[PDB]
Amino acid sequence: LAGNAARDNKKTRIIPRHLQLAVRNDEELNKLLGRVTIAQGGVLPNIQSVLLPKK
DNA sequence: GTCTACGACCAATTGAGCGGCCTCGGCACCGGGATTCTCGATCGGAAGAGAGTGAGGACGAACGCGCCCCCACCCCCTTTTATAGCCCCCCTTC
C-alpha cells in the first residue's frame, strides 16, 4: 500500500507520508495501528463537508 | 497416569549480516511561464411589493307589504207589549 501511495504521488522512495497514508487509508491497518503515531507522517487530507462553502 | 517428542543445553562450524566505504541520481529547491481559482463587479435568469381588472359576496339599507295587538266603542244578544203585512212550513183540498 505504501508503494502504491508513492506512485500516486509520483515518488520512487517510500517516505513517512506514504506510510501514514497507507496505514490510515486501509480500514484494517488503521485499526491495528489506531493507537500508533507515525513520526513525520502527518494526517489524512480530510475536511468536514459542513466547513466547505455553499452556493 | 503414562510416555516419549522434541526443546534446552553444548560444542564446533561458518556465511549471513553489520560497520565502513563509496557514489550518483532521486529528490528539492528555484524560477519562469501557464493555469486555476477566487469573487467584486456587471446584469441574465427567475421571483416579490405594488397596482389595476374583473368581479361578484354579504348585508346595510330602503321600500311595501303583510300578521297580531288592541283601542275602545258600536252592537247584538236577551226580556216585555201593541200593531200589521209579509213570509215560510205544514196541513188540507183537490
PDB file of all heavy atoms in Angstrom, chain B residues 20-34:
ATOM      1  P    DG B  20      31.507   2.147  11.867  1.00  0.00           P
ATOM      2  OP1  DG B  20      32.540   2.597  12.828  1.00  0.00           O
ATOM      3  OP2  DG B  20      30.262   2.931  11.713  1.00  0.00           O
ATOM      4  O5'  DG B  20      32.182   1.994  10.428  1.00  0.00           O
ATOM      5  C5'  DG B  20      33.403   1.282  10.304  1.00  0.00           C
ATOM      6  C4'  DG B  20      33.840   1.190   8.854  1.00  0.00           C
ATOM      7  O4'  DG B  20      32.897   0.412   8.080  1.00  0.00           O
ATOM      8  C3'  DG B  20      33.976   2.545   8.158  1.00  0.00           C
ATOM      9  O3'  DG B  20      35.280   2.661   7.619  1.00  0.00           O
ATOM     10  C2'  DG B  20      32.896   2.520   7.068  1.00  0.00           C
ATOM     11  C1'  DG B  20      32.710   1.028   6.832  1.00  0.00           C
ATOM     12  N9   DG B  20      31.393   0.660   6.323  1.00  0.00           N
ATOM     13  C8   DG B  20      30.178   0.892   6.919  1.00  0.00           C
ATOM     14  N7   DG B  20      29.166   0.441   6.229  1.00  0.00           N
ATOM     15  C5   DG B  20      29.750  -0.129   5.105  1.00  0.00           C
ATOM     16  C6   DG B  20      29.154  -0.776   3.998  1.00  0.00           C
ATOM     17  O6   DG B  20      27.952  -0.980   3.785  1.00  0.00           O
ATOM     18  N1   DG B  20      30.106  -1.207   3.078  1.00  0.00           N
ATOM     19  C2   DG B  20      31.462  -1.034   3.213  1.00  0.00           C
ATOM     20  N2   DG B  20      32.223  -1.518   2.223  1.00  0.00           N
ATOM     21  N3   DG B  20      32.033  -0.430   4.245  1.00  0.00           N
ATOM     22  C4   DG B  20      31.119  -0.004   5.149  1.00  0.00           C
ATOM     23  P    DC B  21      35.802   4.047   6.999  1.00  0.00           P
ATOM     24  OP1  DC B  21      37.276   4.059   7.124  1.00  0.00           O
ATOM     25  OP2  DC B  21      35.004   5.133   7.608  1.00  0.00           O
ATOM     26  O5'  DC B  21      35.423   3.974   5.450  1.00  0.00           O
ATOM     27  C5'  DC B  21      36.128   3.100   4.582  1.00  0.00           C
ATOM     28  C4'  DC B  21      35.434   3.029   3.237  1.00  0.00           C
ATOM     29  O4'  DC B  21      34.103   2.502   3.389  1.00  0.00           O
ATOM     30  C3'  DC B  21      35.274   4.382   2.548  1.00  0.00           C
ATOM     31  O3'  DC B  21      36.187   4.479   1.464  1.00  0.00           O
ATOM     32  C2'  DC B  21      33.806   4.411   2.087  1.00  0.00           C
ATOM     33  C1'  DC B  21      33.331   2.981   2.325  1.00  0.00           C
ATOM     34  N1   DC B  21      31.897   2.892   2.716  1.00  0.00           N
ATOM     35  C2   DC B  21      30.997   2.203   1.897  1.00  0.00           C
ATOM     36  O2   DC B  21      31.407   1.679   0.855  1.00  0.00           O
ATOM     37  N3   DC B  21      29.696   2.131   2.270  1.00  0.00           N
ATOM     38  C4   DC B  21      29.292   2.710   3.401  1.00  0.00           C
ATOM     39  N4   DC B  21      27.999   2.611   3.728  1.00  0.00           N
ATOM     40  C5   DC B  21      30.196   3.414   4.250  1.00  0.00           C
ATOM     41  C6   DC B  21      31.476   3.479   3.871  1.00  0.00           C
ATOM     42  P    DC B  22      36.319   5.837   0.617  1.00  0.00           P
ATOM     43  OP1  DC B  22      37.660   5.842  -0.004  1.00  0.00           O
ATOM     44  OP2  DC B  22      35.916   6.948   1.505  1.00  0.00           O
ATOM     45  O5'  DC B  22      35.222   5.723  -0.538  1.00  0.00           O
ATOM     46  C5'  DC B  22      35.312   4.691  -1.505  1.00  0.00           C
ATOM     47  C4'  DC B  22      34.010   4.568  -2.270  1.00  0.00           C
ATOM     48  O4'  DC B  22      32.930   4.287  -1.361  1.00  0.00           O
ATOM     49  C3'  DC B  22      33.613   5.840  -3.009  1.00  0.00           C
ATOM     50  O3'  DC B  22      33.855   5.698  -4.400  1.00  0.00           O
ATOM     51  C2'  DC B  22      32.125   6.042  -2.684  1.00  0.00           C
ATOM     52  C1'  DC B  22      31.743   4.777  -1.923  1.00  0.00           C
ATOM     53  N1   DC B  22      30.783   5.036  -0.818  1.00  0.00           N
ATOM     54  C2   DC B  22      29.470   4.567  -0.913  1.00  0.00           C
ATOM     55  O2   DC B  22      29.124   3.938  -1.920  1.00  0.00           O
ATOM     56  N3   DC B  22      28.612   4.815   0.107  1.00  0.00           N
ATOM     57  C4   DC B  22      29.024   5.496   1.176  1.00  0.00           C
ATOM     58  N4   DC B  22      28.142   5.716   2.156  1.00  0.00           N
ATOM     59  C5   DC B  22      30.358   5.981   1.290  1.00  0.00           C
ATOM     60  C6   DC B  22      31.194   5.734   0.279  1.00  0.00           C
ATOM     61  P    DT B  23      33.758   6.980  -5.360  1.00  0.00           P
ATOM     62  OP1  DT B  23      34.577   6.710  -6.561  1.00  0.00           O
ATOM     63  OP2  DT B  23      34.049   8.170  -4.528  1.00  0.00           O
ATOM     64  O5'  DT B  23      32.222   7.065  -5.789  1.00  0.00           O
ATOM     65  C5'  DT B  23      31.661   6.041  -6.598  1.00  0.00           C
ATOM     66  C4'  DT B  23      30.168   6.242  -6.773  1.00  0.00           C
ATOM     67  O4'  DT B  23      29.515   6.133  -5.486  1.00  0.00           O
ATOM     68  C3'  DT B  23      29.801   7.616  -7.329  1.00  0.00           C
ATOM     69  O3'  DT B  23      28.748   7.531  -8.285  1.00  0.00           O
ATOM     70  C2'  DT B  23      29.346   8.390  -6.095  1.00  0.00           C
ATOM     71  C1'  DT B  23      28.754   7.289  -5.228  1.00  0.00           C
ATOM     72  N1   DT B  23      28.813   7.583  -3.776  1.00  0.00           N
ATOM     73  C2   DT B  23      27.884   7.012  -2.945  1.00  0.00           C
ATOM     74  O2   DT B  23      27.023   6.247  -3.335  1.00  0.00           O
ATOM     75  N3   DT B  23      28.016   7.347  -1.626  1.00  0.00           N
ATOM     76  C4   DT B  23      28.957   8.192  -1.071  1.00  0.00           C
ATOM     77  O4   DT B  23      28.988   8.441   0.129  1.00  0.00           O
ATOM     78  C5   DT B  23      29.892   8.773  -2.004  1.00  0.00           C
ATOM     79  C7   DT B  23      30.957   9.709  -1.519  1.00  0.00           C
ATOM     80  C6   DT B  23      29.772   8.448  -3.297  1.00  0.00           C
ATOM     81  P    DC B  24      29.069   7.045  -9.784  1.00  0.00           P
ATOM     82  OP1  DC B  24      29.542   5.644  -9.743  1.00  0.00           O
ATOM     83  OP2  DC B  24      29.919   8.084 -10.404  1.00  0.00           O
ATOM     84  O5'  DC B  24      27.651   7.062 -10.523  1.00  0.00           O
ATOM     85  C5'  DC B  24      26.553   6.264 -10.088  1.00  0.00           C
ATOM     86  C4'  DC B  24      25.423   7.159  -9.611  1.00  0.00           C
ATOM     87  O4'  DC B  24      25.744   7.728  -8.318  1.00  0.00           O
ATOM     88  C3'  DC B  24      25.127   8.339 -10.546  1.00  0.00           C
ATOM     89  O3'  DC B  24      23.735   8.459 -10.840  1.00  0.00           O
ATOM     90  C2'  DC B  24      25.630   9.542  -9.740  1.00  0.00           C
ATOM     91  C1'  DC B  24      25.348   9.072  -8.324  1.00  0.00           C
ATOM     92  N1   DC B  24      26.111   9.796  -7.266  1.00  0.00           N
ATOM     93  C2   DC B  24      25.991   9.389  -5.932  1.00  0.00           C
ATOM     94  O2   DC B  24      25.248   8.440  -5.656  1.00  0.00           O
ATOM     95  N3   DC B  24      26.687  10.053  -4.979  1.00  0.00           N
ATOM     96  C4   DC B  24      27.474  11.074  -5.315  1.00  0.00           C
ATOM     97  N4   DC B  24      28.144  11.692  -4.338  1.00  0.00           N
ATOM     98  C5   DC B  24      27.614  11.501  -6.669  1.00  0.00           C
ATOM     99  C6   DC B  24      26.922  10.841  -7.603  1.00  0.00           C
ATOM    100  P    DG B  25      23.065   7.569 -11.997  1.00  0.00           P
ATOM    101  OP1  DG B  25      23.494   6.163 -11.833  1.00  0.00           O
ATOM    102  OP2  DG B  25      23.310   8.262 -13.281  1.00  0.00           O
ATOM    103  O5'  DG B  25      21.498   7.653 -11.697  1.00  0.00           O
ATOM    104  C5'  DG B  25      20.896   6.970 -10.605  1.00  0.00           C
ATOM    105  C4'  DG B  25      20.075   7.944  -9.776  1.00  0.00           C
ATOM    106  O4'  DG B  25      20.945   8.760  -8.950  1.00  0.00           O
ATOM    107  C3'  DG B  25      19.235   8.923 -10.599  1.00  0.00           C
ATOM    108  O3'  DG B  25      18.012   9.176  -9.950  1.00  0.00           O
ATOM    109  C2'  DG B  25      20.099  10.185 -10.582  1.00  0.00           C
ATOM    110  C1'  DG B  25      20.629  10.115  -9.163  1.00  0.00           C
ATOM    111  N9   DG B  25      21.810  10.928  -8.900  1.00  0.00           N
ATOM    112  C8   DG B  25      22.700  11.428  -9.817  1.00  0.00           C
ATOM    113  N7   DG B  25      23.651  12.140  -9.278  1.00  0.00           N
ATOM    114  C5   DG B  25      23.353  12.137  -7.922  1.00  0.00           C
ATOM    115  C6   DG B  25      24.024  12.750  -6.838  1.00  0.00           C
ATOM    116  O6   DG B  25      25.051  13.442  -6.864  1.00  0.00           O
ATOM    117  N1   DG B  25      23.385  12.497  -5.627  1.00  0.00           N
ATOM    118  C2   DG B  25      22.245  11.746  -5.483  1.00  0.00           C
ATOM    119  N2   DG B  25      21.775  11.614  -4.235  1.00  0.00           N
ATOM    120  N3   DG B  25      21.608  11.167  -6.490  1.00  0.00           N
ATOM    121  C4   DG B  25      22.217  11.404  -7.675  1.00  0.00           C
ATOM    122  P    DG B  26      16.667   8.404 -10.364  1.00  0.00           P
ATOM    123  OP1  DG B  26      16.977   6.961 -10.453  1.00  0.00           O
ATOM    124  OP2  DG B  26      16.072   9.106 -11.524  1.00  0.00           O
ATOM    125  O5'  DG B  26      15.727   8.650  -9.098  1.00  0.00           O
ATOM    126  C5'  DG B  26      15.878   7.856  -7.935  1.00  0.00           C
ATOM    127  C4'  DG B  26      15.487   8.639  -6.692  1.00  0.00           C
ATOM    128  O4'  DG B  26      16.497   9.615  -6.348  1.00  0.00           O
ATOM    129  C3'  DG B  26      14.173   9.396  -6.798  1.00  0.00           C
ATOM    130  O3'  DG B  26      13.439   9.285  -5.588  1.00  0.00           O
ATOM    131  C2'  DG B  26      14.594  10.834  -7.108  1.00  0.00           C
ATOM    132  C1'  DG B  26      16.009  10.928  -6.536  1.00  0.00           C
ATOM    133  N9   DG B  26      16.942  11.659  -7.384  1.00  0.00           N
ATOM    134  C8   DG B  26      16.962  11.699  -8.755  1.00  0.00           C
ATOM    135  N7   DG B  26      17.917  12.442  -9.239  1.00  0.00           N
ATOM    136  C5   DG B  26      18.572  12.929  -8.115  1.00  0.00           C
ATOM    137  C6   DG B  26      19.689  13.790  -8.011  1.00  0.00           C
ATOM    138  O6   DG B  26      20.345  14.310  -8.922  1.00  0.00           O
ATOM    139  N1   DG B  26      20.031  14.034  -6.683  1.00  0.00           N
ATOM    140  C2   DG B  26      19.376  13.510  -5.596  1.00  0.00           C
ATOM    141  N2   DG B  26      19.850  13.859  -4.393  1.00  0.00           N
ATOM    142  N3   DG B  26      18.328  12.704  -5.680  1.00  0.00           N
ATOM    143  C4   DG B  26      17.983  12.457  -6.966  1.00  0.00           C
ATOM    144  P    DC B  27      11.997   9.978  -5.448  1.00  0.00           P
ATOM    145  OP1  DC B  27      11.234   9.220  -4.433  1.00  0.00           O
ATOM    146  OP2  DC B  27      11.437  10.153  -6.807  1.00  0.00           O
ATOM    147  O5'  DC B  27      12.331  11.429  -4.867  1.00  0.00           O
ATOM    148  C5'  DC B  27      12.944  11.554  -3.593  1.00  0.00           C
ATOM    149  C4'  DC B  27      13.638  12.896  -3.458  1.00  0.00           C
ATOM    150  O4'  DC B  27      14.571  13.085  -4.530  1.00  0.00           O
ATOM    151  C3'  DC B  27      12.703  14.097  -3.519  1.00  0.00           C
ATOM    152  O3'  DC B  27      12.396  14.538  -2.204  1.00  0.00           O
ATOM    153  C2'  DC B  27      13.475  15.150  -4.339  1.00  0.00           C
ATOM    154  C1'  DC B  27      14.803  14.460  -4.657  1.00  0.00           C
ATOM    155  N1   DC B  27      15.296  14.716  -6.034  1.00  0.00           N
ATOM    156  C2   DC B  27      16.514  15.374  -6.218  1.00  0.00           C
ATOM    157  O2   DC B  27      17.163  15.730  -5.227  1.00  0.00           O
ATOM    158  N3   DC B  27      16.955  15.597  -7.480  1.00  0.00           N
ATOM    159  C4   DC B  27      16.228  15.194  -8.522  1.00  0.00           C
ATOM    160  N4   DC B  27      16.704  15.440  -9.747  1.00  0.00           N
ATOM    161  C5   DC B  27      14.982  14.524  -8.355  1.00  0.00           C
ATOM    162  C6   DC B  27      14.558  14.309  -7.105  1.00  0.00           C
ATOM    163  P    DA B  28      11.277  15.664  -1.962  1.00  0.00           P
ATOM    164  OP1  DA B  28      10.780  15.502  -0.578  1.00  0.00           O
ATOM    165  OP2  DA B  28      10.328  15.593  -3.094  1.00  0.00           O
ATOM    166  O5'  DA B  28      12.053  17.058  -2.064  1.00  0.00           O
ATOM    167  C5'  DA B  28      13.025  17.398  -1.085  1.00  0.00           C
ATOM    168  C4'  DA B  28      13.724  18.705  -1.419  1.00  0.00           C
ATOM    169  O4'  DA B  28      14.475  18.572  -2.662  1.00  0.00           O
ATOM    170  C3'  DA B  28      12.767  19.876  -1.647  1.00  0.00           C
ATOM    171  O3'  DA B  28      13.346  21.083  -1.177  1.00  0.00           O
ATOM    172  C2'  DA B  28      12.615  19.896  -3.157  1.00  0.00           C
ATOM    173  C1'  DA B  28      14.028  19.553  -3.579  1.00  0.00           C
ATOM    174  N9   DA B  28      14.136  19.053  -4.945  1.00  0.00           N
ATOM    175  C8   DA B  28      13.215  18.314  -5.631  1.00  0.00           C
ATOM    176  N7   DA B  28      13.573  18.030  -6.861  1.00  0.00           N
ATOM    177  C5   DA B  28      14.804  18.650  -6.998  1.00  0.00           C
ATOM    178  C6   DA B  28      15.710  18.732  -8.071  1.00  0.00           C
ATOM    179  N6   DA B  28      15.497  18.159  -9.260  1.00  0.00           N
ATOM    180  N1   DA B  28      16.849  19.429  -7.876  1.00  0.00           N
ATOM    181  C2   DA B  28      17.058  20.004  -6.686  1.00  0.00           C
ATOM    182  N3   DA B  28      16.281  19.994  -5.605  1.00  0.00           N
ATOM    183  C4   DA B  28      15.159  19.294  -5.830  1.00  0.00           C
ATOM    184  P    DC B  29      12.403  22.348  -0.872  1.00  0.00           P
ATOM    185  OP1  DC B  29      11.418  21.917   0.143  1.00  0.00           O
ATOM    186  OP2  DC B  29      11.923  22.894  -2.160  1.00  0.00           O
ATOM    187  O5'  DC B  29      13.382  23.415  -0.196  1.00  0.00           O
ATOM    188  C5'  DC B  29      14.749  23.553  -0.595  1.00  0.00           C
ATOM    189  C4'  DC B  29      14.913  24.089  -2.017  1.00  0.00           C
ATOM    190  O4'  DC B  29      14.618  23.122  -3.041  1.00  0.00           O
ATOM    191  C3'  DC B  29      14.077  25.317  -2.367  1.00  0.00           C
ATOM    192  O3'  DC B  29      14.808  26.495  -2.089  1.00  0.00           O
ATOM    193  C2'  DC B  29      13.770  25.142  -3.868  1.00  0.00           C
ATOM    194  C1'  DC B  29      14.537  23.866  -4.232  1.00  0.00           C
ATOM    195  N1   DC B  29      13.895  23.051  -5.300  1.00  0.00           N
ATOM    196  C2   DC B  29      14.588  22.818  -6.493  1.00  0.00           C
ATOM    197  O2   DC B  29      15.731  23.273  -6.624  1.00  0.00           O
ATOM    198  N3   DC B  29      13.995  22.082  -7.462  1.00  0.00           N
ATOM    199  C4   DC B  29      12.765  21.606  -7.279  1.00  0.00           C
ATOM    200  N4   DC B  29      12.220  20.888  -8.267  1.00  0.00           N
ATOM    201  C5   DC B  29      12.038  21.846  -6.078  1.00  0.00           C
ATOM    202  C6   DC B  29      12.632  22.575  -5.129  1.00  0.00           C
ATOM    203  P    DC B  30      14.120  27.938  -2.237  1.00  0.00           P
ATOM    204  OP1  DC B  30      14.905  28.895  -1.428  1.00  0.00           O
ATOM    205  OP2  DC B  30      12.678  27.759  -1.968  1.00  0.00           O
ATOM    206  O5'  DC B  30      14.279  28.307  -3.786  1.00  0.00           O
ATOM    207  C5'  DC B  30      15.577  28.505  -4.324  1.00  0.00           C
ATOM    208  C4'  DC B  30      15.548  28.572  -5.842  1.00  0.00           C
ATOM    209  O4'  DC B  30      15.056  27.338  -6.404  1.00  0.00           O
ATOM    210  C3'  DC B  30      14.665  29.687  -6.403  1.00  0.00           C
ATOM    211  O3'  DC B  30      15.488  30.678  -6.992  1.00  0.00           O
ATOM    212  C2'  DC B  30      13.765  28.992  -7.437  1.00  0.00           C
ATOM    213  C1'  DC B  30      14.435  27.637  -7.626  1.00  0.00           C
ATOM    214  N1   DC B  30      13.491  26.539  -7.971  1.00  0.00           N
ATOM    215  C2   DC B  30      13.595  25.907  -9.216  1.00  0.00           C
ATOM    216  O2   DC B  30      14.471  26.276 -10.008  1.00  0.00           O
ATOM    217  N3   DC B  30      12.731  24.909  -9.519  1.00  0.00           N
ATOM    218  C4   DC B  30      11.802  24.540  -8.637  1.00  0.00           C
ATOM    219  N4   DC B  30      10.972  23.551  -8.982  1.00  0.00           N
ATOM    220  C5   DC B  30      11.680  25.171  -7.364  1.00  0.00           C
ATOM    221  C6   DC B  30      12.538  26.155  -7.075  1.00  0.00           C
ATOM    222  P    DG B  31      14.909  32.134  -7.338  1.00  0.00           P
ATOM    223  OP1  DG B  31      16.059  33.060  -7.425  1.00  0.00           O
ATOM    224  OP2  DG B  31      13.821  32.410  -6.375  1.00  0.00           O
ATOM    225  O5'  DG B  31      14.247  32.004  -8.788  1.00  0.00           O
ATOM    226  C5'  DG B  31      15.086  31.879  -9.927  1.00  0.00           C
ATOM    227  C4'  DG B  31      14.284  31.614 -11.188  1.00  0.00           C
ATOM    228  O4'  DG B  31      13.673  30.291 -11.126  1.00  0.00           O
ATOM    229  C3'  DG B  31      13.127  32.594 -11.411  1.00  0.00           C
ATOM    230  O3'  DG B  31      13.039  32.923 -12.787  1.00  0.00           O
ATOM    231  C2'  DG B  31      11.917  31.793 -10.956  1.00  0.00           C
ATOM    232  C1'  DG B  31      12.306  30.419 -11.453  1.00  0.00           C
ATOM    233  N9   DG B  31      11.546  29.330 -10.845  1.00  0.00           N
ATOM    234  C8   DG B  31      10.982  29.313  -9.592  1.00  0.00           C
ATOM    235  N7   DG B  31      10.335  28.211  -9.330  1.00  0.00           N
ATOM    236  C5   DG B  31      10.451  27.463 -10.494  1.00  0.00           C
ATOM    237  C6   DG B  31       9.944  26.178 -10.806  1.00  0.00           C
ATOM    238  O6   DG B  31       9.270  25.425 -10.091  1.00  0.00           O
ATOM    239  N1   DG B  31      10.289  25.788 -12.096  1.00  0.00           N
ATOM    240  C2   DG B  31      11.031  26.542 -12.973  1.00  0.00           C
ATOM    241  N2   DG B  31      11.263  25.997 -14.175  1.00  0.00           N
ATOM    242  N3   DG B  31      11.512  27.747 -12.694  1.00  0.00           N
ATOM    243  C4   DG B  31      11.184  28.142 -11.440  1.00  0.00           C
ATOM    244  P    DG B  32      12.242  34.240 -13.246  1.00  0.00           P
ATOM    245  OP1  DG B  32      12.806  35.378 -12.488  1.00  0.00           O
ATOM    246  OP2  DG B  32      10.792  33.963 -13.165  1.00  0.00           O
ATOM    247  O5'  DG B  32      12.644  34.415 -14.783  1.00  0.00           O
ATOM    248  C5'  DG B  32      12.888  33.289 -15.632  1.00  0.00           C
ATOM    249  C4'  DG B  32      11.634  32.465 -15.896  1.00  0.00           C
ATOM    250  O4'  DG B  32      11.210  31.694 -14.761  1.00  0.00           O
ATOM    251  C3'  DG B  32      10.410  33.261 -16.325  1.00  0.00           C
ATOM    252  O3'  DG B  32      10.408  33.406 -17.734  1.00  0.00           O
ATOM    253  C2'  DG B  32       9.227  32.412 -15.816  1.00  0.00           C
ATOM    254  C1'  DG B  32       9.906  31.258 -15.064  1.00  0.00           C
ATOM    255  N9   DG B  32       9.218  30.849 -13.841  1.00  0.00           N
ATOM    256  C8   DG B  32       9.079  31.571 -12.683  1.00  0.00           C
ATOM    257  N7   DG B  32       8.411  30.941 -11.757  1.00  0.00           N
ATOM    258  C5   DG B  32       8.084  29.724 -12.341  1.00  0.00           C
ATOM    259  C6   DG B  32       7.361  28.627 -11.818  1.00  0.00           C
ATOM    260  O6   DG B  32       6.849  28.508 -10.697  1.00  0.00           O
ATOM    261  N1   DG B  32       7.256  27.590 -12.742  1.00  0.00           N
ATOM    262  C2   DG B  32       7.784  27.614 -14.010  1.00  0.00           C
ATOM    263  N2   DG B  32       7.581  26.520 -14.757  1.00  0.00           N
ATOM    264  N3   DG B  32       8.464  28.636 -14.511  1.00  0.00           N
ATOM    265  C4   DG B  32       8.574  29.652 -13.623  1.00  0.00           C
ATOM    266  P    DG B  33       9.289  34.286 -18.477  1.00  0.00           P
ATOM    267  OP1  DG B  33       9.831  34.676 -19.797  1.00  0.00           O
ATOM    268  OP2  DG B  33       8.837  35.326 -17.526  1.00  0.00           O
ATOM    269  O5'  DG B  33       8.077  33.270 -18.697  1.00  0.00           O
ATOM    270  C5'  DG B  33       8.254  32.162 -19.553  1.00  0.00           C
ATOM    271  C4'  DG B  33       7.091  31.195 -19.456  1.00  0.00           C
ATOM    272  O4'  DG B  33       6.973  30.678 -18.099  1.00  0.00           O
ATOM    273  C3'  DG B  33       5.722  31.795 -19.799  1.00  0.00           C
ATOM    274  O3'  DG B  33       5.098  30.985 -20.785  1.00  0.00           O
ATOM    275  C2'  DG B  33       4.977  31.819 -18.468  1.00  0.00           C
ATOM    276  C1'  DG B  33       5.611  30.654 -17.739  1.00  0.00           C
ATOM    277  N9   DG B  33       5.504  30.762 -16.285  1.00  0.00           N
ATOM    278  C8   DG B  33       5.946  31.799 -15.500  1.00  0.00           C
ATOM    279  N7   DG B  33       5.698  31.633 -14.231  1.00  0.00           N
ATOM    280  C5   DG B  33       5.027  30.419 -14.173  1.00  0.00           C
ATOM    281  C6   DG B  33       4.503  29.722 -13.060  1.00  0.00           C
ATOM    282  O6   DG B  33       4.530  30.051 -11.867  1.00  0.00           O
ATOM    283  N1   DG B  33       3.901  28.526 -13.439  1.00  0.00           N
ATOM    284  C2   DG B  33       3.816  28.064 -14.730  1.00  0.00           C
ATOM    285  N2   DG B  33       3.196  26.889 -14.901  1.00  0.00           N
ATOM    286  N3   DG B  33       4.303  28.708 -15.782  1.00  0.00           N
ATOM    287  C4   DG B  33       4.893  29.874 -15.430  1.00  0.00           C
ATOM    288  P    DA B  34       3.611  31.281 -21.316  1.00  0.00           P
ATOM    289  OP1  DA B  34       3.544  30.834 -22.725  1.00  0.00           O
ATOM    290  OP2  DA B  34       3.261  32.679 -20.973  1.00  0.00           O
ATOM    291  O5'  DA B  34       2.710  30.307 -20.429  1.00  0.00           O
ATOM    292  C5'  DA B  34       2.874  28.908 -20.602  1.00  0.00           C
ATOM    293  C4'  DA B  34       1.855  28.102 -19.823  1.00  0.00           C
ATOM    294  O4'  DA B  34       2.034  28.316 -18.397  1.00  0.00           O
ATOM    295  C3'  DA B  34       0.405  28.453 -20.137  1.00  0.00           C
ATOM    296  O3'  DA B  34      -0.336  27.257 -20.349  1.00  0.00           O
ATOM    297  C2'  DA B  34      -0.055  29.261 -18.923  1.00  0.00           C
ATOM    298  C1'  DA B  34       0.819  28.716 -17.803  1.00  0.00           C
ATOM    299  N9   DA B  34       1.134  29.721 -16.791  1.00  0.00           N
ATOM    300  C8   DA B  34       1.664  30.962 -17.006  1.00  0.00           C
ATOM    301  N7   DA B  34       1.853  31.656 -15.910  1.00  0.00           N
ATOM    302  C5   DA B  34       1.428  30.808 -14.903  1.00  0.00           C
ATOM    303  C6   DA B  34       1.373  30.953 -13.504  1.00  0.00           C
ATOM    304  N6   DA B  34       1.768  32.057 -12.862  1.00  0.00           N
ATOM    305  N1   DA B  34       0.893  29.916 -12.788  1.00  0.00           N
ATOM    306  C2   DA B  34       0.500  28.813 -13.434  1.00  0.00           C
ATOM    307  N3   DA B  34       0.503  28.561 -14.743  1.00  0.00           N
ATOM    308  C4   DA B  34       0.984  29.609 -15.428  1.00  0.00           C
TER     309       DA B  34
END
